[PDB]
């Protein structure tokens, strides 16, 4: 009878009704990956009774073109081409209800230079799907071709060191404390003292923006005085991460422009600003000769648990793409969650020109960085100079070691605190380069106790804190040991 009825689609695939995502062409056991594909590795915990291939295909489809029922509108497009392929599923080591699922997405699916669009597809909906009890994005292969649309770090490790005139040892910093309550005046005091005592940097706390107790312009002006006073006293380029985090993008710029205008070398942003402001202020930082330090605030809400979320290693990739110059990536031995293996992989992702597969470090995909610049990892949170031998071994050369409490907590004052940390650092590096087995539980502590014999502030820091450790079990562990 009626025209709607005579022209119904009657094929197996585009007849109306629900068919499984695997039978919609989102699964292919022998897809061959192209060098232009976005690859994603997911850790999928299917619900009781849901097939492991089905859940992998479901994730492929709802992150590319599918929906829950069949649509004739597919056929207005080159739908073979746009469909993502779940193309491999292994079971997760030592578990028969959790799976590693590899999914490949066609290059053309993604807006050029838009982390917002990349994430809209890849994390948009699928983590809240009913058929899946848990889901974690473990890794991604960002293809060269997509990477070339992005800026990468504004300054990057190499140019940063050049603007600083500091090569050979890890760089040094401290978060100003207490976190909140200090007036701009006193902030400028802490910054002057710490920088004058040996620190390359200080920083605003992540949550120091502009508050009744201290409005932002006061902090910036008073810190600049402190910074330039420090550099006049030492003959070093100095700085402090002036926090430009704000409610609106107009305010963030206003703060960035103010930082620039008064001569600041560096500014910080919080991750809670979100990806679009981050990309904006990363382009801005390139164009205005500014270091951009990303504090990763909020990360561990999705990054902490192994069964579900986004692994921080993917956040590394996305943030290096967007173009931040620094990003916090963990300490191993401090107050914040850090397994040595996972931190090492984070550091490789941020620093290397390319990645080779290394499953113990959580590097699931091999990947070229497409001459995007290298992002400076930051090691921060409850660390002290008694741990310096551990810091050097675990974290390498290109890194900023931050000691907020480990500098300011020092009983002989802030300058004493800073000096203890830099002597610590320099002697440890000096020693490594000479061939000494610095990481040995005997030698390492001894190199510092020897350095302490000619540095008063160091003896004191060793005396005060050498018991201190944060010896707890990890949540984010590897599935392959070393």
């Amino acid at each position: 009878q009626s025209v709607s009825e005579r022209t119904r689609i009657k094929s197996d695939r585009y007849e109306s009704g629900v068919i499984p995502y695997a039978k919609m062409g989102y699964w292919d056991a022998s897809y061959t990956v192209k060098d232009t594909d976005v690859l994603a590795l997911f850790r999928i915990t299917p619900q009781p009774g849901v097939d492991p291939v089905e859940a992998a295909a479901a994730v492929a489809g709802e992150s590319s073109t599918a929906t829950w029922t069949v649509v004739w509108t597919d056929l207005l497009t080159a739908c073979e081409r746009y469909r993502a392929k779940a193309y491999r599923v292994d079971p997760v080591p030592n578990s028969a209800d959790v799976f590693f699922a590899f999914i490949a997405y066609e290059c053309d699916l993604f807006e050029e230079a838009s982390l917002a669009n990349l994430t809209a597809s890849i994390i948009g909906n699928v983590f809240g799907f009913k058929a899946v009890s848990a889901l974690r994005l473990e890794d991604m292969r960002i293809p060269h071709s997509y990477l070339x649309t992005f800026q990468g770090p504004a300054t990057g490790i190499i140019v940063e060191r050049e603007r600083l005139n500091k090569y050979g040892t890890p760089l040094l910093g401290a978060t100003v404390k207490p976190k909140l309550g200090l007036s701009g005046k006193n902030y400028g005091r802490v910054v002057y003292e710490g920088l004058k005592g040996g620190l390359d940097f200080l920083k605003d706390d992540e949550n120091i923006n502009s508050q009744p107790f201290m409005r932002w312009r006061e902090r910036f002006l008073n810190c600049m005085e402190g910074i330039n006073r420090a550099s006049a006293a030492t003959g070093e380029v100095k700085g402090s991460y002036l926090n430009i985090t704000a409610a609106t993008m107009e305010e963030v710029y206003k703060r960035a422009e103010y930082a620039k205008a008064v001569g600041s070398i560096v500014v910080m942003i919080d991750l809670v600003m979100g990806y679009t402001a981050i990309q904006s202020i990363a382009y801005w930082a390139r164009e205005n000769d500014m270091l951009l330090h990303l504090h990763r605030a909020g990360n561990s809400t999705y990054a902490r648990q192994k069964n579900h979320g986004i692994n921080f290693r993917v956040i590394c990739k996305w943030m290096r793409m967007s173009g931040v110059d620094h990003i916090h990536a963990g300490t191993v031995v401090g107050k914040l969650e850090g397994d040595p293996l996972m931190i090492k992989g984070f550091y490789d992702i941020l620093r290397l020109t390319e990645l080779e597969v290394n499953l113990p470090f959580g590097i699931f995909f091999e990947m070229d960085w497409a001459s995007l610049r290298r992002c400076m990892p930051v090691a921060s949170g409850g660390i002290h100079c008694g741990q310096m031998h551990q810091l050097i071994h675990y974290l390498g050369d290109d890194v900023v070691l931050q000691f907020g409490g480990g500098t300011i907590g020092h009983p002989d004052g802030i300058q004493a605190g800073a000096t203890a940390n830099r002597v610590a650092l320099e002697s440890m590096v000096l020693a490594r380069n000479e061939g000494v087995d610095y990481f040995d539980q005997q030698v390492g502590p001894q190199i510092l106790r020897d350095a302490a014999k000619t540095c008063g502030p160091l003896q004191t820091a060793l005396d005060l804190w050498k018991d201190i450790s944060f010896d707890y079990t990890s949540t984010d562990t590897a599935d392959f040991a070393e």
Binding site: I158, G168, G235, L352, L430
Partner: protein, 139 residues
């Protein structure tokens, strides 16, 4: 004051033998060494004076050390550093830089403040050595 540029400047002035070991490290890593001189200690003095060309071909620390001491004997009073340079892709930069020599009497700097708009200040870091005398007779 002690000029704390370079990466080992919160340690004591390095001996020839301690410098040879740092040179050894750098040569075993494939890096290129060079030696440079200045008597402008300003933090923004990017370009210190080259002492010859960088030593790319060299297979023996003693050569760097021999050049260091030739530079020591020819250059006026001031600062000498040795840099290590990594031509590798994704580095292409200095990876090590430390002071080998520093004059006995470094007065340092004063901070020079010019009034900008509102409360803003225009800072210039000024060196006593440089303002009093020309290059070659500052220390």
């Amino acid at each position: 004051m002690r000029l704390t540029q370079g990466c080992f400047s919160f340690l004591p002035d390095l001996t020839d033998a301690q410098i040879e070991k740092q040179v050894a490290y750098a040569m075993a890593k494939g890096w290129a060494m060079n030696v440079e001189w200045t008597d402008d200690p300003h933090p923004r003095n990017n370009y210190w004076e080259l002492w010859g060309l960088p030593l790319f071909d060299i297979k023996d620390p003693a050569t760097v050390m021999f050049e260091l001491n030739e530079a020591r004997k020819s250059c006026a009073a001031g600062y000498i550093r040795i840099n290590a340079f990594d031509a590798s892709y994704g580095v292409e930069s200095c990876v090590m830089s430390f002071i080998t020599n520093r004059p006995t009497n470094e007065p340092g700097f004063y901070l020079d403040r010019t009034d900008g708009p509102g409360r803003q200040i225009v800072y210039s870091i000024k060196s006593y050595s440089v303002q009093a005398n020309p290059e070659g007779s500052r220390y």
